[PDB]
Amino acid sequence: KPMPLTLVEQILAEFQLQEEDLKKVMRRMQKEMDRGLRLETHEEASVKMLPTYVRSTPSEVGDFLSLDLGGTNFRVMLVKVGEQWSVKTKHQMYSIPEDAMTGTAEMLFDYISECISDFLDKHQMKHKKLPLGFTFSFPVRHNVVGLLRDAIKRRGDFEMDVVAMVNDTVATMISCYYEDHQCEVGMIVGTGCNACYMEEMQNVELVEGDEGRMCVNTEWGAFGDSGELDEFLLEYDRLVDESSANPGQQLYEKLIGGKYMGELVRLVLLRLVDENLLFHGEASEQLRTRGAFETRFVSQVESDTGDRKQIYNILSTLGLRPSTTDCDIVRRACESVSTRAAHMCSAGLAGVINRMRESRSEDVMRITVGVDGSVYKLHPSFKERFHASVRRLTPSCEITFIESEEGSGRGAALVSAVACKKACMLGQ
Numbered sequence: 001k002p003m004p005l006t007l008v009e010q011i012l013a014e015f016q017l018q019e020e021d022l023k024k025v026m027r028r029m030q031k032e033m034d035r036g037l038r039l040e041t042h043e044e045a046s047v048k049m050l051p052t053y054v055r056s057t058p059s060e061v062g063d064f065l066s067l068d069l070g071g072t073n074f075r076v077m078l079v080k081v082g083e084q085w086s087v088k089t090k091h092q093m094y095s096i097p098e099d100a101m102t103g104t105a106e107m108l109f110d111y112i113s114e115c116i117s118d119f120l121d122k123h124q125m126k127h128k129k130l131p132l133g134f135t136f137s138f139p140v141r142h143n144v145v146g147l148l149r150d151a152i153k154r155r156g157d158f159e160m161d162v163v164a165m166v167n168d169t170v171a172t173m174i175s176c177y178y179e180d181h182q183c184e185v186g187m188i189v190g191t192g193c194n195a196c197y198m199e200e201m202q203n204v205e206l207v208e209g210d211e212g213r214m215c216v217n218t219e220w221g222a223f224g225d226s227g228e229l230d231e232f233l234l235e236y237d238r239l240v241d242e243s244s245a246n247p248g249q250q251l252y253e254k255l256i257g258g259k260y261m262g263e264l265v266r267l268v269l270l271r272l273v274d275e276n277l278l279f280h281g282e283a284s285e286q287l288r289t290r291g292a293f294e295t296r297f298v299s300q301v302e303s304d305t306g307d308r309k310q311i312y313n314i315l316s317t318l319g320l321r322p323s324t325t326d327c328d329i330v331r332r333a334c335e336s337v338s339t340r341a342a343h344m345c346s347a348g349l350a351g352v353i354n355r356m357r358e359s360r361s362e363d364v365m366r367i368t369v370g371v372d373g374s375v376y377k378l379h380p381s382f383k384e385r386f387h388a389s390v391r392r393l394t395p396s397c398e399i400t401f402i403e404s405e406e407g408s409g410r411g412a413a414l415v416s417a418v419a420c421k422k423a424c425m426l427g428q
């Protein structure tokens with residue numbers, strides 16, 4: 001690596017978070033998680049710690065449908081979960097014709113409903129009112145219940161209960177649990193950022209009972225609206241927040257999520273431009289346009305192999321004619337913002353993991369964390385930086401991170417299993 005420019009590094013060093021900063025953030029998150037779990041303070045808690053009713057001990061529904069929506073295809077699957085759970089399946093991929101996917105959402109779901117009808121006919125299952133759950137297998141890149149319910153109603157020939165979907169973190173946890181039974185945490189680092197985890201029932205005060213565990217959806221994105229992050233906020237963060245749809249809210253998520261990451265980079269570049277450290281102090285009109293620097297541009301800039309080809313092509317699109325030095329600085333700006341996201345994210349997850357270790361009275365905790373989302377998956381080195389930081393903040397914990405594999409769709413079928421069983425348990 002070359003000796004970097006001192007004045008550039010000074011500006012980028014503002015993104016740095018040391019271990020004591022993260023431990024401070026982690027402890028503040030833990031207090032908000034506590035406040036979310038308590039009956040007395042939950043109502044006023046910013047981090048809601050929502051009971052998911054996904055329990056460690058499951059009631060008996062037999063057959064059900066799982067409907068996996070892809071980009072331009074979908075899968076209908078008939079599932080039977082037997083007791084060690086066996087996931088028995090038969091399925092069918094359907095392609096969506098152009099008219100179906102270019103019409104209204106109703107017309108699209110009329111088609112989906114026709115395919116389900118055809119599938120049920122094929123398997124002679126029209127005699128049952130089956131519950132159906134949705135899962136998503138979109139190609140990763142930086143409502144459906146109602147639509148299907150309405151479309152089934154419109155057909156008026158067979159009945160079927162479309163069950164409420166679980167939160168994406170929960171689906172991630174369940175899907176990953178299928179592969180690894182030590183998975184008791186689900187994390188999403190995508191456009192948004194969130195985590196769920198298996199809390200001790202005694203700590204879930206919103207649900208009576210102290211036996212077993214229940215999944216809690218932190219909705220930790222809302223952390224920060226009482227100033228818990230204020231000392232770590234930079235000018236760029238303040239501007240992002242100020243121009244957002246919800247100023248003052250989702251401050252934690254605003255530091256991590258792919259929704260704002262590109263914008264943060266854009267503002268960093270503009271400051272470097274303003275200080276005559278980048279593009280010889282001339283920014284393009286595209287660079288001075290809000291949202292122009294897409295988050296996908298950040299991961300792409302960081303994917304560059306040293307060739308500067310990726311970066312030069314990104315910046316040329318933005319009407320810039322960058323020198324080699326410009327490209328190198330832009331990469332380091334991207335690094336600085338993305339590493340900070342990984343740091344901030346790690347403090348949250350570390351807070352959860354250390355809480356679990358304490359709650360379970362375990363000297364050494366062994367645990368798997370299931371993770372999904374565009375940032376975590378597509379951003380080069382983000383998950384590695386995230387992993388290393390989480391582990392640094394979690395002594396006495398041995399943490400395995402997994403991403404669920406499509407496989408044969410059984411992890412996804414299990415998500416629908418739980419969703420259907422939950423709906424049943426709650427009396428729909």
Ligand SMILES: O=C(Nc1nccs1)[C@H](CC1CCCCC1)n1c(=O)[nH]c2ccc(F)cc2c1=O
Pocket residue numbers: 053054055056057058059084085173174177178183184198417418421422425
């Ligand atoms: O289905 C479950 N709970 C429900 N609550 C309400 C309705 S159904 C949980 C979920 C599981 C998720 C991952 C963490 C541990 C609990 N669950 C089990 O309890 N036991 C299991 C045993 C084998 C298996 F393959 C899956 C599960 C399972 O998902």
Ligand SMILES: OC[C@H]1O[C@H](O)[C@H](O)[C@@H](O)[C@@H]1O
Pocket residue numbers: 167168169188190191192193194195219221253
């Ligand atoms: O998609 C990841 C997360 O994004 C947002 O924070 C949503 O509020 C949350 O429910 C979701 O889990």
